[PDB]
Design an enzyme around this catalytic site. Structure first.
Site, PDB file in Angstrom:
ATOM      1  N   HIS A   1     101.347  55.958 131.294  1.00  0.00           N
ATOM      2  CA  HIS A   1     102.049  56.112 130.012  1.00  0.00           C
ATOM      3  C   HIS A   1     103.454  56.617 130.323  1.00  0.00           C
ATOM      4  O   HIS A   1     103.693  57.825 130.409  1.00  0.00           O
ATOM      5  CB  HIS A   1     101.301  57.052 129.076  1.00  0.00           C
ATOM      6  CG  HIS A   1     101.913  57.169 127.710  1.00  0.00           C
ATOM      7  ND1 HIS A   1     101.170  57.499 126.600  1.00  0.00           N
ATOM      8  CD2 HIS A   1     103.197  57.059 127.287  1.00  0.00           C
ATOM      9  CE1 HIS A   1     101.967  57.586 125.545  1.00  0.00           C
ATOM     10  NE2 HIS A   1     103.200  57.316 125.933  1.00  0.00           N
TER      11      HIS A   1
ATOM     12  N   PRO B   1     110.280  45.369 123.715  1.00  0.00           N
ATOM     13  CA  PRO B   1     111.271  44.285 123.809  1.00  0.00           C
ATOM     14  C   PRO B   1     112.212  44.343 122.614  1.00  0.00           C
ATOM     15  O   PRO B   1     111.779  44.553 121.478  1.00  0.00           O
ATOM     16  CB  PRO B   1     110.420  43.015 123.798  1.00  0.00           C
ATOM     17  CG  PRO B   1     108.992  43.474 124.150  1.00  0.00           C
ATOM     18  CD  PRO B   1     108.898  44.872 123.579  1.00  0.00           C
TER      19      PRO B   1
ATOM     20  N   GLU C   1      99.504  61.547 116.850  1.00  0.00           N
ATOM     21  CA  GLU C   1     100.675  62.357 117.174  1.00  0.00           C
ATOM     22  C   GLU C   1     101.040  63.321 116.048  1.00  0.00           C
ATOM     23  O   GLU C   1     101.655  64.369 116.305  1.00  0.00           O
ATOM     24  CB  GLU C   1     101.874  61.463 117.456  1.00  0.00           C
ATOM     25  CG  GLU C   1     101.863  60.863 118.825  1.00  0.00           C
ATOM     26  CD  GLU C   1     103.080  60.001 119.031  1.00  0.00           C
ATOM     27  OE1 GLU C   1     104.120  60.536 119.475  1.00  0.00           O
ATOM     28  OE2 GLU C   1     102.996  58.809 118.713  1.00  0.00           O
TER      29      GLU C   1
ATOM     30  N   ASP D   1     107.714  60.451 128.750  1.00  0.00           N
ATOM     31  CA  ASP D   1     109.158  60.171 128.835  1.00  0.00           C
ATOM     32  C   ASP D   1     109.749  61.192 129.810  1.00  0.00           C
ATOM     33  O   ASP D   1     110.228  62.244 129.376  1.00  0.00           O
ATOM     34  CB  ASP D   1     109.858  60.291 127.482  1.00  0.00           C
ATOM     35  CG  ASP D   1     109.303  59.371 126.415  1.00  0.00           C
ATOM     36  OD1 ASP D   1     109.612  58.167 126.433  1.00  0.00           O
ATOM     37  OD2 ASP D   1     108.610  59.877 125.494  1.00  0.00           O
TER      38      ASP D   1
HETATM   39  C1  LIG Z   1     107.389  61.451 122.092  1.00  0.00           C
HETATM   40  N1  LIG Z   1     106.329  60.468 122.337  1.00  0.00           N
HETATM   41  C2  LIG Z   1     106.521  59.165 121.790  1.00  0.00           C
HETATM   42  N2  LIG Z   1     105.867  58.900 120.667  1.00  0.00           N
HETATM   43  C3  LIG Z   1     106.007  57.681 120.073  1.00  0.00           C
HETATM   44  N3  LIG Z   1     106.797  56.745 120.631  1.00  0.00           N
HETATM   45  C4  LIG Z   1     107.447  57.049 121.759  1.00  0.00           C
HETATM   46  C5  LIG Z   1     107.340  58.220 122.363  1.00  0.00           C
HETATM   47  N4  LIG Z   1     108.109  58.200 123.484  1.00  0.00           N
HETATM   48  C6  LIG Z   1     108.692  56.978 123.548  1.00  0.00           C
HETATM   49  N5  LIG Z   1     108.255  56.265 122.473  1.00  0.00           N
HETATM   50  C7  LIG Z   1     108.688  54.898 122.173  1.00  0.00           C
HETATM   51  O1  LIG Z   1     109.324  54.350 123.314  1.00  0.00           O
HETATM   52  C8  LIG Z   1     110.651  53.905 122.969  1.00  0.00           C
HETATM   53  C9  LIG Z   1     111.596  54.131 124.123  1.00  0.00           C
HETATM   54  O2  LIG Z   1     111.332  53.288 125.239  1.00  0.00           O
HETATM   55  P1  LIG Z   1     111.537  51.706 125.161  1.00  0.00           P
HETATM   56  O3  LIG Z   1     112.796  51.451 124.342  1.00  0.00           O
HETATM   57  O4  LIG Z   1     110.287  51.121 124.547  1.00  0.00           O
HETATM   58  O5  LIG Z   1     111.658  51.351 126.632  1.00  0.00           O
HETATM   59  C10 LIG Z   1     111.013  54.714 121.730  1.00  0.00           C
HETATM   60  O6  LIG Z   1     112.000  54.067 120.942  1.00  0.00           O
HETATM   61  C11 LIG Z   1     109.684  54.890 121.007  1.00  0.00           C
HETATM   62  O7  LIG Z   1     109.393  53.781 120.168  1.00  0.00           O
END
Ligand SMILES: CNc1ncnc2c1ncn2[C@@H]1O[C@H](COP(=O)(O)O)[C@@H](O)[C@H]1O
EC number: 3.5.4.-
Length: 341
Positions: free
Chosen positions: A14, A100, A206, A282
């Site tokens: 993840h 995407p 969440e 992240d």
């Molecule tokens: C805090 N935890 C989280 N909860 C929900 N969505 C999350 C997230 N962390 C990331 N994202 C999702 O991942 C995207 C960024 O990477 P990508 O543009 O896809 O590579 C975010 O815009 C969100 O939609």
């Protein structure tokens, strides 16, 4: 302590691409875009600096990041850098997820965005990489549906994933702001994905949302992420359905979704022998690493090296990889096992 954890072979399930960016890369992109006048660099540097990363502020931060990173050559760059960063801490298997994007003004489609991700994988040279079908890392891809999307745009993502199974796409995620959108918008596209043998992982719980949590569990995805606001009926169903949980410790503490590591549900799941996988979520946004996540869990639970290695190895059967890759991972772990006693 941290040295043996850094040396442990690890499986990351993840990790969002645009949440995993090096601070130095994000600031460099901002500087370039300011020199072109697209943004005021000082304000951007300020938001990257000051956003408290509460749940609401995290999604504002992603809107800013996407203003900096949504072009093909940047997608290629950050894909390569994220793979390098995980490989350097001995991640041997990475499922990298990303939404995407379509950006009509630059000729970017969801397909071309994902082609830029593939180009990023092909560009990796500091480590050996396996993604189709001196450290070595297996990389497979999940395409994320953002909860801001429509059913038809979610279906475009699913169709693209099916088209890209030959370059390592193995699954679909539902993610994005959990305060936005309805499960009924996305359930039909996720059902199409599941019926076409893609693996599914859902961000679930969440925020408090009892009906949605039950509906996501009843869908029987192959994994879920987070699970912060489950109630007892949700835990009973989860444990009966044996759905692995992607555990995001630092994320959940920083966003105030979980009060502390010492009450975090990963401990109850561990003691109940329920499948869980420690994940970064992240690592750029939350300034962490997969080794640091393991260190937090190891300290909180008081795990031995052998228990930690066993937990790391248990993630193999929660991957969405083809069986041959899982066999290779079992070989990698069994070969490293004597070094973690
Ligand atoms: C805090 N935890 C989280 N909860 C929900 N969505 C999350 C997230 N962390 C990331 N994202 C999702 O991942 C995207 C960024 O990477 P990508 O543009 O896809 O590579 C975010 O815009 C969100 O939609």
């Amino acid at each position: 302590h941290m040295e043996w954890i850094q040396s442990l072979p690890k499986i990351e399930l993840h990790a969002h691409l645009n949440g995993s960016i090096r601070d130095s890369t994000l600031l460099e992109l901002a500087r370039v875009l300011g020199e072109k006048g697209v943004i005021v660099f000082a304000d951007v540097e300020h938001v990257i600096q000051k956003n408290d990363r509460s749940l609401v502020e995290v999604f504002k931060l992603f809107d800013l990041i996407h203003k900096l990173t949504t072009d093909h050559k940047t997608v290629t760059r950050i894909t390569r850098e994220v793979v390098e960063d995980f490989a350097l801490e001995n991640v041997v298997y990475l499922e990298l997820r990303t939404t995407p994007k379509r950006s009509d003004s630059i000729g970017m489609s969801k397909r071309s965005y994902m082609e830029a991700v593939i180009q990023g994988l092909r560009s990796v040279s500091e480590v050996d990489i396996d993604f189709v079908t001196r450290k070595k890392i297996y990389v497979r891809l999940l395409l994320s549906i953002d909860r801001r999307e429509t059913t038809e745009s979610a279906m475009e993502t699913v169709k693209l994933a099916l088209e890209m199974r030959d370059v390592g796409v193995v699954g679909i995620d539902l993610s994005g702001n959990p305060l936005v959108g309805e499960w009924s918008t996305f359930l039909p596209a996720l059902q199409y994905a599941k019926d076409n043998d893609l693996h599914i992982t859902l961000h679930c719980g969440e925020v408090p949302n009892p009906k949605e949590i039950q509906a996501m569990l009843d869908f029987k995805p192959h994994r879920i992420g987070h699970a912060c606001f489950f109630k007892d009926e949700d835990w009973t169903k989860l444990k009966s359905f044996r759905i692995p949980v992607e555990i995001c410790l630092t994320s959940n503490i920083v966003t105030k979704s979980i009060s502390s590591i010492d009450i975090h549900h990963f401990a109850d799941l561990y003691n109940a022998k329920h499948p869980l996988i420690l994940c970064t979520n992240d690592f750029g946004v939350f300034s962490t690493s997969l080794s640091n996540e393991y260190a937090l869990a190891v300290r909180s639970l008081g795990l031995s090296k052998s228990e930690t290695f066993a937990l790391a190895r248990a993630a193999i059967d929660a991957t969405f990889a083809e069986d041959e890759v899982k066999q290779q991972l079992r070989f990698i772990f069994d070969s490293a096992s004597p070094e973690h006693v």
